[PDB]
Design an enzyme around this catalytic site. Structure first.
Site, PDB file in Angstrom:
ATOM      1  N   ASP B  25       0.797  -1.217   0.000  1.00  0.00           N
ATOM      2  CA  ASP B  25       0.000   0.000   0.000  1.00  0.00           C
ATOM      3  C   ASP B  25       0.835   1.274   0.000  1.00  0.00           C
ATOM      4  O   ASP B  25       1.309   1.701   1.065  1.00  0.00           O
ATOM      5  CB  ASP B  25      -0.923   0.031   1.200  1.00  0.00           C
ATOM      6  CG  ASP B  25      -1.925   1.126   1.126  1.00  0.00           C
ATOM      7  OD1 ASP B  25      -1.947   1.998   0.201  1.00  0.00           O
ATOM      8  OD2 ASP B  25      -2.802   1.092   2.016  1.00  0.00           O
ATOM      9  N   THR B  26       0.972   1.874  -1.182  1.00  0.00           N
ATOM     10  CA  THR B  26       1.764   3.086  -1.351  1.00  0.00           C
ATOM     11  C   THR B  26       1.084   4.284  -0.711  1.00  0.00           C
ATOM     12  O   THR B  26       1.738   5.313  -0.486  1.00  0.00           O
ATOM     13  CB  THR B  26       2.019   3.332  -2.825  1.00  0.00           C
ATOM     14  OG1 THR B  26       0.752   3.607  -3.470  1.00  0.00           O
ATOM     15  CG2 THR B  26       2.685   2.166  -3.429  1.00  0.00           C
ATOM     16  N   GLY B  27      -0.228   4.187  -0.407  1.00  0.00           N
ATOM     17  CA  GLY B  27      -0.865   5.274   0.293  1.00  0.00           C
ATOM     18  C   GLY B  27      -0.694   5.307   1.802  1.00  0.00           C
ATOM     19  O   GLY B  27      -1.210   6.235   2.437  1.00  0.00           O
TER      20      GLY B  27
HETATM   21  C1  LIG Z   1     -12.667  -5.742   4.328  1.00  0.00           C
HETATM   22  C2  LIG Z   1     -12.534  -4.311   3.772  1.00  0.00           C
HETATM   23  O1  LIG Z   1     -13.166  -3.515   4.756  1.00  0.00           O
HETATM   24  P1  LIG Z   1     -13.661  -1.953   4.486  1.00  0.00           P
HETATM   25  O2  LIG Z   1     -14.398  -1.753   3.219  1.00  0.00           O
HETATM   26  C3  LIG Z   1     -12.084  -0.904   4.398  1.00  0.00           C
HETATM   27  O3  LIG Z   1     -11.133  -1.871   4.049  1.00  0.00           O
HETATM   28  C4  LIG Z   1      -9.880  -1.163   3.758  1.00  0.00           C
HETATM   29  C5  LIG Z   1      -9.395  -0.066   4.698  1.00  0.00           C
HETATM   30  C6  LIG Z   1      -8.091   0.662   4.404  1.00  0.00           C
HETATM   31  C7  LIG Z   1      -7.315   0.302   3.180  1.00  0.00           C
HETATM   32  C8  LIG Z   1      -6.031   1.061   2.844  1.00  0.00           C
HETATM   33  C9  LIG Z   1      -6.421   2.486   2.604  1.00  0.00           C
HETATM   34  N1  LIG Z   1      -7.324   2.617   1.441  1.00  0.00           N
HETATM   35  C10 LIG Z   1      -8.646   3.216   1.486  1.00  0.00           C
HETATM   36  O4  LIG Z   1      -9.064   3.833   2.424  1.00  0.00           O
HETATM   37  O5  LIG Z   1      -9.294   3.014   0.230  1.00  0.00           O
HETATM   38  C11 LIG Z   1     -10.583   3.494   0.107  1.00  0.00           C
HETATM   39  C12 LIG Z   1     -10.740   3.987  -1.265  1.00  0.00           C
HETATM   40  O6  LIG Z   1     -10.960   2.885  -2.021  1.00  0.00           O
HETATM   41  C13 LIG Z   1     -11.626   1.909  -1.017  1.00  0.00           C
HETATM   42  O7  LIG Z   1     -10.866   0.526  -1.336  1.00  0.00           O
HETATM   43  C14 LIG Z   1     -10.289   0.185  -0.184  1.00  0.00           C
HETATM   44  C15 LIG Z   1     -10.929   0.992   0.918  1.00  0.00           C
HETATM   45  C16 LIG Z   1     -11.495   2.270   0.194  1.00  0.00           C
HETATM   46  C17 LIG Z   1      -5.235   3.392   2.182  1.00  0.00           C
HETATM   47  O8  LIG Z   1      -4.540   2.735   1.165  1.00  0.00           O
HETATM   48  C18 LIG Z   1      -4.220   3.619   3.317  1.00  0.00           C
HETATM   49  N2  LIG Z   1      -4.776   4.637   4.262  1.00  0.00           N
HETATM   50  C19 LIG Z   1      -4.277   6.051   4.217  1.00  0.00           C
HETATM   51  C20 LIG Z   1      -5.336   7.129   3.774  1.00  0.00           C
HETATM   52  C21 LIG Z   1      -4.386   8.311   3.314  1.00  0.00           C
HETATM   53  C22 LIG Z   1      -4.144   9.092   4.593  1.00  0.00           C
HETATM   54  C23 LIG Z   1      -6.459   6.752   2.831  1.00  0.00           C
HETATM   55  C24 LIG Z   1      -7.415   7.952   2.743  1.00  0.00           C
HETATM   56  S1  LIG Z   1      -5.273   4.022   5.782  1.00  0.00           S
HETATM   57  O9  LIG Z   1      -5.543   2.585   5.676  1.00  0.00           O
HETATM   58  O10 LIG Z   1      -6.344   4.876   6.263  1.00  0.00           O
HETATM   59  C25 LIG Z   1      -3.842   4.231   6.854  1.00  0.00           C
HETATM   60  C26 LIG Z   1      -3.854   5.393   7.732  1.00  0.00           C
HETATM   61  C27 LIG Z   1      -2.675   5.629   8.583  1.00  0.00           C
HETATM   62  C28 LIG Z   1      -1.571   4.646   8.543  1.00  0.00           C
HETATM   63  C29 LIG Z   1      -0.339   4.917   9.424  1.00  0.00           C
HETATM   64  C30 LIG Z   1      -0.686   5.947  10.475  1.00  0.00           C
HETATM   65  O11 LIG Z   1       0.570   5.423   8.475  1.00  0.00           O
HETATM   66  C31 LIG Z   1      -1.546   3.476   7.620  1.00  0.00           C
HETATM   67  C32 LIG Z   1      -2.738   3.226   6.753  1.00  0.00           C
HETATM   68  C33 LIG Z   1      -7.810  -0.758   2.258  1.00  0.00           C
HETATM   69  C34 LIG Z   1      -9.110  -1.477   2.527  1.00  0.00           C
HETATM   70  O12 LIG Z   1     -14.448  -1.533   5.866  1.00  0.00           O
HETATM   71  C35 LIG Z   1     -15.155  -0.325   5.848  1.00  0.00           C
HETATM   72  C36 LIG Z   1     -15.567  -0.096   7.322  1.00  0.00           C
END
Ligand SMILES: CCOP(=O)(COc1ccc(C[C@H](NC(=O)O[C@H]2CO[C@H]3OCC[C@H]32)[C@H](O)CN(CC(CC)CC)S(=O)(=O)c2ccc([C@H](C)O)cc2)cc1)OCC
EC number: 3.4.23.16
Lengths: 99, 99
Positions: B25-27
């Protein structure tokens, strides 16, 4: 280009004719941008992330230019902490991970 | 290898002696793993993304093997919905974005 990951992979995008900064996010299925004015019709959508679900506006078939590469696809607008380019558009510009 | 982004970039990791699936995860600045009871001391932290914040435990100098490439660094443990390999470890295995 080849983009290393010592720093956040931030790029300039062009959308609705204006420039913005966004994060290339391989962990994102979908592209999500902070609150902005976009032309066209949209539908309410919900999207989930690390902290739970948020309400967004779903714009379909939107033109976006990412570092000079054209994409046309879905863009979600809502209260994301950061503008993120997800896989739906990364695939259109031919992005891969390599190591 | 080369990982295209048509699907989620899921890979097998080895951590604390166990095998798990995780997203490259590059984000993500930092790496966040599902609840696991790891030995050693930790510090509490809150981390935020879409939907708000979650409480995690911060462990330092943890070894992880990602597709056979070893990395050592900070890992956050808590109730994340998915295992996330962030840039702090991706940089160690030589991961780049290319388009
Ligand atoms: C079973 C699946 O369950 P859900 O659907 C969610 O599952 C997920 C949840 C998170 C991810 C990965 C995250 N992607 C994400 O948010 O993507 C959105 C858009 O596209 C959708 O696709 C996938 C989800 C939707 C980001 O890549 C990384 N993030 C950063 C921020 C940038 C600041 C993103 C805005 S971070 O994880 O928040 C985070 C925060 C701080 C830290 C430390 C501090 O550095 C590390 C990681 C992938 C799947 O449950 C719903 C309740």
């Amino acid at each position: 280009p080849q983009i290393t990951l010592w720093k956040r992979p931030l790029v300039t995008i062009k959308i609705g004719g204006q420039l913005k900064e966004a994060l290339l996010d391989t962990g994102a299925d979908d592209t999500v941008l902070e609150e902005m004015n976009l032309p066209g019709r949209w539908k309410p959508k919900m999207i989930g992330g690390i902290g739970g679900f948020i309400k967004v506006r779903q714009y379909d078939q939107i033109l976006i230019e990412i570092c000079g590469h054209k994409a046309i696809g879905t863009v979600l607008v809502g209260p994301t902490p950061v503008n993120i380019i997800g896989r739906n558009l990364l695939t259109q510009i031919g992005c891969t991970l390599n190591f």
